Structure formats: structure tokens, C-alpha cells
């Protein structure tokens, strides 16, 4: 599950709505630990 | 992250060269479909 917001809400270009800033609990090298990761995804790759 | 402003990805095709290219294509299409006709180019239909 990803928690995504619009990367920049101030864009007035054709790119508004593209590039979402998605956070998730990703696994790490050790099986017992988790890490919080923030990354950008294109709108076409992420579905609500 | 992205350094600096967010800009849309794009392609640039010269108008004069493309228009000449289509002119060549229309005459070659006319050789099979008939002269004194209208050849229309339009955007692709929907799908994937």
C-alpha cells in the first residue's frame, strides 16, 4: 500500500497531476526490520 | 527527487520536413487508392 500526494501542487504546466510523492513501508536487508521510503512515481504507474 | 523545475518530456519534429514527408506519402498512397481523392491523417484510435 502506497500513501501518495501530488509532488508539487503549485504546478501550472501540463505536468500537474504527474509525478506523485508516494510513501511506503519497504523491507530492508534484515528480515526483522522495516524502513520508510519516499519516492516519486509517474501517475501512469500508480492506481488508486 | 528532482533538482530544479518540473518540465514535461517531449519530442520535436520539424514542420517543413514532416510536411514534405507527408506530401511524399500522399502521392505514393494515391498511386494505389486513386487520384482526385482526399487523403486524411488523423490521430490514432483508442486502446492500450
Amino acid at each position, epitope marked *: 500500500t502506497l500513501q501518495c500526494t501530488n509532488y*508539487t501542487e*503549485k*504546478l*501550472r*504546466s*501540463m*505536468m*500537474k497531476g504527474e509525478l506523485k510523492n508516494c510513501s511506503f513501508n519497504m523491507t530492508t536487508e534484515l528480515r526483522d526490520k522495516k524502513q520508510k521510503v519516499y519516492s516519486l512515481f509517474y501517475r501512469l504507474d500508480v492506481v488508486q | 527527487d*528532482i*533538482i*530544479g*523545475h*518540473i*518540465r*514535461q518530456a*517531449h519530442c520535436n519534429v520539424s514542420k517543413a520536413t514532416w510536411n514534405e514527408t507527408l506530401g511524399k506519402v500522399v502521392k505514393q498512397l494515391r498511386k494505389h487508392f486513386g487520384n482526385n481523392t482526399i487523403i486524411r491523417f488523423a490521430q490514432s484510435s483508442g486502446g492500450d
Partner: antibody, heavy 130, light 111 residues
Framework: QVQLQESGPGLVKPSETLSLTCAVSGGSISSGHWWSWVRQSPGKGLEWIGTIYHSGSANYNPSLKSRVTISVDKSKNQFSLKLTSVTAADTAVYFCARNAILIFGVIAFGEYYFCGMDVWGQGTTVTVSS | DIVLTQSPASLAVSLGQRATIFCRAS??????????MHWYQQKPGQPPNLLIYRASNLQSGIPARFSGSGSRADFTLTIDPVEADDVATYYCQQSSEDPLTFGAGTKLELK
């Protein structure tokens, strides 16, 4: 450089429409700049009314959207503002100004962020009275 | 709307003394690293004249004594030294989000 000169009624009866025309002299309205209107009035700091691109697309202040229309006349090199249903609260000095643009990219895709009103006119004082 | 709080309403210094005028936006005006904070000098009876663009860049034709600074919503503009010809009402302006908004205006006078 380019100078801006305004003209229109300085006295408008309440509830009619004010029409101000700003002439552009020395520059060209049909250029990569946005044209805008700003007002000043005692008790109120500068308040933005709206802005136009020579393509005809325009942005307006949300509280005035129902009453202010602006336009560009490419043959006259003039920028016009028509404000309907004027009230006593609308008394102000109205300035025409040129808003410089960063244009960091292809203008067809937006990619323009407004960056400074560098040229201002002298201001037309308008009082609403009758 | 983005609301700009300007402070002080009035500031006065003697000739040769530097002055700083503050502008506090209700929200961030930095878009992808560029601080869209503008600063104008409006002399009494005159239109405002843009002095500083993109928060810290000096406009061409404006004396070198003017400069700016700031990031996010907290901006500080300054005159160093203030001269006799600098008596004016100064305003901040934001272009981050429509509608464009202006500050209250600070009256700089000689003392």
C-alpha cells in the same frame, strides 16, 4: 523600453460598468509577457484584478470572477478592463502593468511562472459617485 | 489565497543607516527551489517600481544598495544605506499561487 498609458472615466455612477483602456507604446502587446491590472485604495494595499496573455487566455482574482472581464486588442495594441456593478468600495487608482515571465520550457505546455511586474503606468483615479 | 503579513507598518532611520523590512507569507512561495517573492518601492504619488525579483535578485537600473533574502514564507528585504531619495512605501508580492497578493505596505521615512 515600453510605456503604459491609461484612459477612461474617472467618475462612474454606482452599478454601471467602468471601462479602462491601457495603451502600450514602445513595446508590443503580442509578445511573451502577460498584461495585468492592479488597484490601490486608502485602507487597502495593492489588489490584483486579473491578467491576460495575447492568446486570449486569462486569469482572474476569485472574488471578482463574476464582475471583471479583460481583453487584448492586437490591432490597437491596447489592453482593456470592463468592471460591472461598481460600488463605492471600488474607488481606487487603477494601474496597467507588464508581468515578466520565467518561461522555463515550452510555453505550449504551460511552464511559465509569473516573475515580477517590471513596467507600471501612472494610474487612473476612479471614484464611484453620483 | 496566499496572505502576506508585512512588518513593521512604519520604520524610520537616519541617513546612512541600514534598514530591514520583513514579509511573512501565510504559506510557502518557493516552487521547485525558486523563491517567488517580489519587492517594490512605491513613492508617494507614483506607481510601484519593481526592485527585487525572485526574492534576492536586483532589478536592472536599481541602485546596488538594494538586496533581498529569504526562503519558504519568511523573507527579509533591506536597504543599505538608506538615502534621502528612498522615502517610500515598500510592498512585498507573491506569484506562487493565484490570485496574486500584495503586502500591507511599510512607510520608510527619514529620522
Amino acid at each position: 523600453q515600453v510605456q503604459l498609458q491609461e484612459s477612461g472615466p474617472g467618475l462612474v455612477k454606482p452599478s454601471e460598468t467602468l471601462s479602462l483602456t491601457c495603451a502600450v507604446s514602445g513595446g508590443s502587446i503580442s509578445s511573451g509577457h502577460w498584461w495585468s491590472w492592479v488597484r490601490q485604495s486608502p485602507g487597502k494595499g495593492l489588489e490584483w484584478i486579473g491578467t491576460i496573455y495575447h492568446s486570449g487566455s486569462a486569469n482572474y482574482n476569485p472574488s471578482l470572477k463574476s464582475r471583471v472581464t479583460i481583453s487584448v486588442d492586437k490591432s490597437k495594441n491596447q489592453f482593456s478592463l470592463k468592471l460591472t456593478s461598481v460600488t463605492a468600495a471600488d474607488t481606487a487608482v487603477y494601474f496597467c502593468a507588464r508581468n515578466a515571465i520565467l518561461i522555463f520550457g515550452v510555453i505550449a505546455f504551460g511552464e511559465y511562472y509569473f516573475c515580477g511586474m517590471d513596467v507600471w503606468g501612472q494610474g487612473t483615479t476612479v471614484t464611484v459617485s453620483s | 489565497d496566499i496572505v502576506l503579513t508585512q512588518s513593521p507598518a512604519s520604520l524610520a532611520v537616519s541617513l546612512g543607516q541600514r534598514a530591514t523590512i520583513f514579509c511573512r507569507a501565510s504559506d510557502t512561495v518557493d516552487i521547485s527551489g525558486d523563491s517567488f517573492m517580489h519587492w517594490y518601492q512605491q513613492k508617494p504619488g507614483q506607481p510601484p517600481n519593481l526592485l527585487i525579483y525572485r526574492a534576492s535578485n536586483l532589478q536592472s537600473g536599481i541602485p546596488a544598495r538594494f538586496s533581498g533574502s529569504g526562503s519558504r514564507a519568511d523573507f527579509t528585504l533591506t536597504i543599505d544605506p538608506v538615502e534621502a531619495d528612498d522615502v517610500a512605501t515598500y510592498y512585498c508580492q507573491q506569484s506562487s499561487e493565484d490570485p496574486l497578493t500584495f503586502g500591507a505596505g511599510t512607510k520608510l521615512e527619514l529620522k
